[PDB]
Amino acid sequence: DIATLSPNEQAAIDAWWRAANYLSVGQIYLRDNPLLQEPLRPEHIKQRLLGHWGSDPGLSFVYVHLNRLIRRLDLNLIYVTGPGHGAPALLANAWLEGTYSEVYPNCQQSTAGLQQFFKQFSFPGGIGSHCTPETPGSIHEGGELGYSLSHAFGAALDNPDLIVACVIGDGEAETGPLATSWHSNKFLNPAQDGAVLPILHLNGYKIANPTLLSRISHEELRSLFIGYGYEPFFVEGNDPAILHGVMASTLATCVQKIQAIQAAARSGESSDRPMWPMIVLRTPKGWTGPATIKGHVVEGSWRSHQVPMADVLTNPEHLQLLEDWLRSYRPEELFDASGAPVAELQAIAPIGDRRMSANPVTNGGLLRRALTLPDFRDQAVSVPAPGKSRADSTRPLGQFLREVIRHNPDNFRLFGPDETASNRLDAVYEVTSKVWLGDRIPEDEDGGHLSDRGRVMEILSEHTLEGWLEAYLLTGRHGFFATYEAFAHVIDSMVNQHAKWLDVSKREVDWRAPVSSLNILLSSTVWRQDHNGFSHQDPGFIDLVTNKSARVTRIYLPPDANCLLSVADHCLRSTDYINVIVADKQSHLQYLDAEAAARHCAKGIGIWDWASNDQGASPDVVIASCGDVVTLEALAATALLREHFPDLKIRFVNVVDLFRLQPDTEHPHGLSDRDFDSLFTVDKPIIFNFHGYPWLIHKLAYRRHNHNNLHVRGYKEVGNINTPLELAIRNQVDRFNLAIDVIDRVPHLRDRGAHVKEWLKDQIHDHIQYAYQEGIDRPEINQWQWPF
Amino acid sequence: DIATLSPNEQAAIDAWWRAANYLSVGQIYLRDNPLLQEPLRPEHIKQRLLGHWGSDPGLSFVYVHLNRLIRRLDLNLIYVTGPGHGAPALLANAWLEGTYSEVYPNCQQSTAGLQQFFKQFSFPGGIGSHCTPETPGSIHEGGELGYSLSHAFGAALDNPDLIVACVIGDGEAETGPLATSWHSNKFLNPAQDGAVLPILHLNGYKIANPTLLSRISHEELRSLFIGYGYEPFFVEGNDPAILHGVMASTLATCVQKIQAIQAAARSGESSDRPMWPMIVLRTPKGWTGPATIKGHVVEGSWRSHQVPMADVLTNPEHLQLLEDWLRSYRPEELFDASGAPVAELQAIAPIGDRRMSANPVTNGGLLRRALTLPDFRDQAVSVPAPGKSRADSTRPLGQFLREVIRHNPDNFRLFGPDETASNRLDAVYEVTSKVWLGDRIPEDEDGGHLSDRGRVMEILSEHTLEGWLEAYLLTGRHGFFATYEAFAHVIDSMVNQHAKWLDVSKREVDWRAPVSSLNILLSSTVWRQDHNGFSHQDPGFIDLVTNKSARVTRIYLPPDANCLLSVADHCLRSTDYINVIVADKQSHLQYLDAEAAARHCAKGIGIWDWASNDQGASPDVVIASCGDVVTLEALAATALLREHFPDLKIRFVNVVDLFRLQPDTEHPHGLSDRDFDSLFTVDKPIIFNFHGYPWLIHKLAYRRHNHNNLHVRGYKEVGNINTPLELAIRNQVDRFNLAIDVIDRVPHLRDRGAHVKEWLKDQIHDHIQYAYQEGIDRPEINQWQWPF
Numbered sequence A, B: 001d002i003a004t005l006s007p008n009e010q011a012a013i014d015a016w017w018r019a020a021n022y023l024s025v026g027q028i029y030l031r032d033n034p035l036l037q038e039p040l041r042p043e044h045i046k047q048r049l050l051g052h053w054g055s056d057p058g059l060s061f062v063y064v065h066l067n068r069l070i071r072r073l074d075l076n077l078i079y080v081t082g083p084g085h086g087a088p089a090l091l092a093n094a095w096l097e098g099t100y101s102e103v104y105p106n107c108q109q110s111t112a113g114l115q116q117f118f119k120q121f122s123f124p125g126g127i128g129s130h131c132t133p134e135t136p137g138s139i140h141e142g143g144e145l146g147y148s149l150s151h152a153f154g155a156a157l158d159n160p161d162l163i164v165a166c167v168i169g170d171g172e173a174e175t176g177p178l179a180t181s182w183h184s185n186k187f188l189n190p191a192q193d194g195a196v197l198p199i200l201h202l203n204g205y206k207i208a209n210p211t212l213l214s215r216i217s218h219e220e221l222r223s224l225f226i227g228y229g230y231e232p233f234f235v236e237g238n239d240p241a242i243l244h245g246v247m248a249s250t251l252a253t254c255v256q257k258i259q260a261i262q263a264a265a266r267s268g269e270s271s272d273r274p275m276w277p278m279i280v281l282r283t284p285k286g287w288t289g290p291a292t293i294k295g296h297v298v299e300g301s302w303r304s305h306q307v308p309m310a311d312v313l314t315n316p317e318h319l320q321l322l323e324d325w326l327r328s329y330r331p332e333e334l335f336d337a338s339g340a341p342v343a344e345l346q347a348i349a350p351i352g353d354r355r356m357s358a359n360p361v362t363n364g365g366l367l368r369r370a371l372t373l374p375d376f377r378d379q380a381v382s383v384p385a386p387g388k389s390r391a392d393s394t395r396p397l398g399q400f401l402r403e404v405i406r407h408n409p410d411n412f413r414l415f416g417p418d419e420t421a422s423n424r425l426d427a428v429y430e431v432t433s434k435v436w437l438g439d440r441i442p443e444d445e446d447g448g449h450l451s452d453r454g455r456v457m458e459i460l461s462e463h464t465l466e467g468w469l470e471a472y473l474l475t476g477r478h479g480f481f482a483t484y485e486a487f488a489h490v491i492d493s494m495v496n497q498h499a500k501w502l503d504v505s506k507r508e509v510d511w512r513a514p515v516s517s518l519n520i521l522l523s524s525t526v527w528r529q530d531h532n533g534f535s536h537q538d539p540g541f542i543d544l545v546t547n548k549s550a551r552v553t554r555i556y557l558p559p560d561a562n563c564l565l566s567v568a569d570h571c572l573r574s575t576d577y578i579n580v581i582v583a584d585k586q587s588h589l590q591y592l593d594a595e596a597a598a599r600h601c602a603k604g605i606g607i608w609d610w611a612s613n614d615q616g617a618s619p620d621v622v623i624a625s626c627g628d629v630v631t632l633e634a635l636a637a638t639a640l641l642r643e644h645f646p647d648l649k650i651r652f653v654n655v656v657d658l659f660r661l662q663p664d665t666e667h668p669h670g671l672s673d674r675d676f677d678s679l680f681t682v683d684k685p686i687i688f689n690f691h692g693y694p695w696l697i698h699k700l701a702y703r704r705h706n707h708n709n710l711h712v713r714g715y716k717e718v719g720n721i722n723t724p725l726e727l728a729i730r731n732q733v734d735r736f737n738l739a740i741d742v743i744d745r746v747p748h749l750r751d752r753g754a755h756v757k758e759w760l761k762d763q764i765h766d767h768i769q770y771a772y773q774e775g776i777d778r779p780e781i782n783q784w785q786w787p788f
């Protein structure tokens, strides 16, 4: 009889819901006198009110009913919260369960604890107004709307017994990212993955406008969610006495369907995509607060958002209304004399680790197991001569990722936006295929690698693809994101949200265990100009992640395949960083051996001895490169200069870890002044080729002593369509432009390099003319290799 | 008998479709011998193949059938293209119509012209592989997928007789932005707006993966689009003989419904939201190219994306197959001896301006009419004393925008992501309300401002909101975007796409008339930290738009309301810029009179005489500010310094136009070296308060002579929750931190300013302690005003 509830246990559910609402109101308003033992006075109210109330009753209404199902059916849920500004509702229920008392002993379950509990919310030196990392049992910050549903599916990607209850605000459902995330049920395998129970909180209003989904007809709303692949169940009303029975019955039915779906799939008798149940709530906005305030409707309206009454200190009448509002929950029968919840409320709280706020899944770092990585030197290419052998850069990486999948069959996934094949990572398909969970045709088997049990996630929407990965990591698993650099601006907002989550969890919150790292691989960079991607690519994503501190983000630009393996191997072991790896899929030169590449990545930046002209003497110029396309151009320029000026001494420096340039004061990761002055001399000119905007190097190396002698070339603009070398000429990162820049900077070459500079300009013109006539570069340009 | 088509006219339609397909293949592959008069040889094939073929037959199939309806029903369409990489299909049909010959006389309709026509595509010194601005009759670039449907609705926002046929690739429909854009039919008013006929090109595959929408059941697909508010019609098959009849019948029926919908709405007898017709195409991908190539299925598969055969010069067998492919269209009966389309094809082309490629709507600058702007000096606040009066900053702007709406009732709209009321722009509601076109309840009137004829567009999603505006501008109308700075990262990718469109159209394309400017207003900046927005706001959007050159983007940071009006007035007259206006909604000080604000905006950066300490003497320090919150702190610091050091001489410089700092060499807009050295002295230290990342100032003013003496304070990081003054202290942009920095930099104060520096530090500590105890700043901090 799970569907029906006894009248007495409905009272306990109702009492819990009132208590949660009372604590929600207290946090927003009160600063002292939590239990209204003495009459409310203006010194008890917070001066600045920033909390949100409109969505709080709805979140608490769902939370109390989910707790009922946990006690009876012994489930485990995590309750990903969409609105995010309904943080008071989550904290209030966590406090009642006892989770908040355990995590924060200061906010004890007593009258003194309540005063501290109310005081801290939305207060300086206290918790924030959203679901920040300080919130127990929270994986989604919720401040930026649209990513709640994708996070729900990410947390359920490999937890077969987990059920994720994601509450979505209708205002959030208008956003782009969330509209696609509904389709993510077609990538969820019932046999080996958990279930997501999305609940659409259709209160009917945003801050100031009716929501789109509330104002479409009931038939259209039902048809919309059937099209998404769900089976919608509607819970509508405004009377708690009726809604308690309806909500309990509907939730019980939905969970039975979810268990029925999983049981059939795991038995192997029904391997077909099911209609996942879904719940729609039509509760009024703020449907327990004041009805009218200033002659306007406040309950179930857009005015219920955040604070119904902002002016309470000034207006004594409003303060009386606020006091009447608190009394409406009848706190005298909810808390005992000491200030703790009465025995009635304690009896219906989940016990121990079953509590949604205390679920270990939310604090995923506790469940994180280190990846069993194979030795990457077994996939490294062979380079008997550096700079003379040619091989495909991403083929070794695909093989390495294939091995990682084999040895980590449950806690590793590969995320790629329909470009894993385009990125030349087909080696991963030799063991596992892409997960589809949809209908299949015979032509798919020949062409594509599709199966229900697939460790590679593919969908064009990079918003939901990024959402899956972030939730996957915060749950304690590992993953690798491989995409194009042209489309990195799409996930720009999501990376910022994840970046601030890691930063806060690392420093401010001490009970948050370290989660795995967010590894992003960007291929097909701006310079090659592949067939895919728009004409005007942009390396601006590298700039936007540098705004985040070096304590949370790392950027790597490996020059060849072996260095890519070392970077990939190292970054699969890190914990609390956003690693951005900029590689290129085209067949390039190979410079570093397996052992040499490993040492190079350990230093992050080093001098290439085979390319450097003279050791044991002071260099005349330091030529540095960061990317891998620009690395070839820098080497080609070095070959030209050494051929035309035999006595010129050149030191070649290649930098892989971009944040090594920052001084040691900014971060312990950066190079010290002595170490930096050793690589880049204190007085000789530095010619720096860089994949990306040339100014990013100036920002990092601004505090250095020799910054005034640093000359950076890099991406400026791209024409409509160009050959690989013509594009380099336009941005002046070409081999000839690099050689010309060296001649200008070196003092003793200004008079002696006049003849060579003229010849170099002729080469620039000659190659451009050939490009226009033939559309391709000369054969000796594509087949260039280190001559010394 | 529009539905049925005569057998003879079906032959003409088929002949046109074959001709369009033949030209599509020629552009991708051929470089000479366009009509295959001589046998195909490897010297005729392009060396590098970058064109896309998979989507080309589908686009041409729709295009030829739309042209049939234009001739018969005298419609006018624009054919917004979603795939974008199907550029060859658009150019081929433009060539056949004659539009391409007229716009580009070099590519004449002859054998010589065809050779030039094929040669230029995807070739250096030629057109690109996407729908760049060079493409006749194109408003959407299509390179970044997901924005096609929003652009279709933007183009029809005020053209009552226009019908927009938007073709959407199924892979694009997976993206987040496009999933929301389906709901934009609920903001389109049938009475006064055009219609959008979205066509879903469901070929079943992307580059390497089956598409999500193709693999859901037919019933789910139908239910999904009924939920979006459309009435889906399915056109399925692979035999052109049958599809020609079915496609013609379906298109004719859909247009009759669209005309029936508009006629009923304009008659006033049915003011209800209708079910807009929509079409789903299930044609195979590349369903006229080769069937098998290397033992794999190539037609109607993911291998048909871009080029079916990449190795043609190397493999003689593939070249044979390519030659057989071209012959399959039978070019001998499509082009005459001279190389022009036969009289049969010419007879079915639309005449003159009815051609979709020649429609003036696509080249919106031709239809652009200047906005009738009222004198902004009638909405200006009064400031008898600068820096002493306090007034709301956005209230005058809302009144000004209300006047603009009244005098421009047809070609001006205001776009706001459900924050116009929160942004304190309710003055606009005094004349026109928000457009809803959905069901309404009585509570809606009493509170919100909703009506079918509304000039304010409000949807929570910012991808579709930005998409509407960009299409609105490119169609020749005007608009104003008002949003929060915290959510500017969402429209990050869309702005870059619009930025490159304006840049290419301004320089490369000469027949593109100048469209109106994209005016973006960012309110509720990071410093105030209002209730809305996540805790960790970011001013990074300002940095990203600076990566674009100053020739396409402008950034303004007005300090008060009157300067905000002048900036808004000026930027409503500009044409080809992306104007970013960073204001703040909170009640601030007012510094500039209506006349003074006008002069200040004309110069872009000037010396405030009332705040400057001593004229006629060399300043000891130049204090500069950019934003408006930091402007108050800079003024407060000046008041402290002038109070404690009477003999200190301070020059106060306020900069509104950010790009004025760039040297005149970078752009003619920037200040000359003499002008810059006049404002900021050549040798005295400069203390620069900046709203945003402090390094952006260094990037702009790097080439200046006095850059080494420039010290920028700005946004660094934000705590979980802070008061307005505590946040400034953390970032050291506070008045006390500013005063301390001045004491350090000024050489003759480092000894005399020891006592004052200690007192300033005490003030910092004292205010922080009060904030922690009370949660609010001291009254004398909020009520500060210029004392001199």
Ligand SMILES: Cc1ncc(C[n+]2csc(CCOP(=O)(O)OP(=O)(O)O)c2C)c(N)n1
Pocket (backbone or CB within 6 Å): A054, A055, A083, A085, A143, A144, A145, A146, A168, A169, A170, A171, A172, A173, A175, A201, A203, A205, A206, A207, A211, A285, B417, B418, B460, B461, B462, B487, B490, B532, B533, B534
């Ligand atoms: C993309 C985006 N647009 C706007 C906002 C501003 N915002 C913060 S909370 C909120 C309300 C969202 O409404 P809904 O999801 O219905 O929430 P509820 O009514 O349950 O509070 C809005 C618009 C945002 N955070 N992100």
Ligand SMILES: Cc1ncc(C[n+]2csc(CCOP(=O)(O)OP(=O)(O)O)c2C)c(N)n1
Pocket (backbone or CB within 6 Å): A417, A418, A460, A461, A462, A487, A490, A532, A533, A534, B054, B055, B083, B085, B143, B144, B145, B146, B168, B169, B170, B171, B172, B173, B175, B201, B202, B203, B204, B205, B206, B207, B211
């Ligand atoms: C957001 C985004 N993801 C991925 C890409 C890369 N891309 C460009 S075209 C394409 C194929 C998808 O095209 P589809 O919509 O299926 O069109 P059709 O071939 O049916 O015309 C892809 C993945 C992109 N440009 N933008």
Ligand SMILES: [Mg+2]
Pocket (backbone or CB within 6 Å): A055, A169, A170, A171, A201, A202, A203, A204, A205, A206, A211
């Ligand atoms: Mg809501």
Ligand SMILES: [Mg+2]
Pocket (backbone or CB within 6 Å): B169, B170, B171, B201, B202, B203, B204, B205, B206, B211
């Ligand atoms: Mg497709």
